[PDB]
Amino acid sequence: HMFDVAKYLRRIGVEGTPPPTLDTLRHLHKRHLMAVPYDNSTAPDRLLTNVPLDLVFGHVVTEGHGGVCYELNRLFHTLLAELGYDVRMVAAAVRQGTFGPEREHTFDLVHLDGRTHLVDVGFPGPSYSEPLYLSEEEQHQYGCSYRVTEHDGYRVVERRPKGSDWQPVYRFRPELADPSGWDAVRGTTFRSRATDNGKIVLIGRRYFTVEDGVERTKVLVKADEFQDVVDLILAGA
Numbered sequence: 001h002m003f004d005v006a007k008y009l010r011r012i013g014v015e016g017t018p019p020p021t022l023d024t025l026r027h028l029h030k031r032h033l034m035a036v037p038y039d040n041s042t043a044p045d046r047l048l049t050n051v052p053l054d055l056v057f058g059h060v061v062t063e064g065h066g067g068v069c070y071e072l073n074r075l076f077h078t079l080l081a082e083l084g085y086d087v088r089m090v091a092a093a094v095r096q097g098t099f100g101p102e103r104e105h106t107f108d109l110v111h112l113d114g115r116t117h118l119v120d121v122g123f124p125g126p127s128y129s130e131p132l133y134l135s136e137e138e139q140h141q142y143g144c145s146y147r148v149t150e151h152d153g154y155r156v157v158e159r160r161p162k163g164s165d166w167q168p169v170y171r172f173r174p175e176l177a178d179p180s181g182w183d184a185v186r187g188t189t190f191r192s193r194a195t196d197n198g199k200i201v202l203i204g205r206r207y208f209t210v211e212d213g214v215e216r217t218k219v220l221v222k223a224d225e226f227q228d229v230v231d232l233i234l235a236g237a
């Protein structure tokens with residue numbers, strides 16, 4: 001179907017058309033991550049400007065499936081722009097102990113009332129479920145700590161759950177952000193979604209959960225447990 005803001009808000013469980021404020025941005029970001037799972041399982045059958053936005057919208061919103069970073073963050077960029085925000089696309093290199101290709105991960109920045117926020121509803125692993133300030137200052141979300149440090153002309157998103165040291169998530173160059181950047185974008189299954197107070201992630205057989213900053217992981221053995229976790233992730237919340 002054709003892109004429709006109202007249909008999209010309904011799909012992620014947001015009522016009405018809330019105003020273009022920081023509180024609205026936080027709510028949209030968290031609802032999107034809870035309702036729209038990351039899922040690369042059929043990413044090959046949809047491969048950036050040469051993929052019409054309506055095809056991705058149809059797959060994710062109209063049909064209710066998940067997607068990957070250059071699908072979910074591309075749709076969310078469009079939604080935020082239609083809702084009145086100053087939104088900019090930026091590419092990142094993912095901590096793979098080394099950082100991978102320099103434009104592997106695509107996400108968004110929003111500039112609002114003199115502050116810049118990171119927006120990412122399309123990263124598979126444990127990462128922030130509400131937008132981060134673009135700041136080295138430490139920020140706290142559901143018991144996890146976050147900061148955006150500066151190292152060697154890169155900003156680096158770092159995360160610290162309970163019982164852990166600081167972990168880099170990905171790194172990016174803020175000055176390469178682009179309001180129109182989506183028009184320029186060039187074997188294991190990853191599936192995840194946010195919960196009310198954390199995130200659940202399945203990579204191959206490896207099941208990861210974080211709740212109030214407390215992490216648990218298990219390599220799944222049984223087929224019925226595997227099926228149950230897939231259903232739990234893909235059902236949304």
Ligand SMILES: Cc1cc(N)cc(O)c1
Pocket residue numbers: 040069094096104105106123124190
């Ligand atoms: C670690 C990872 C990051 C991204 N952006 C995509 C993937 O399939 C895996």
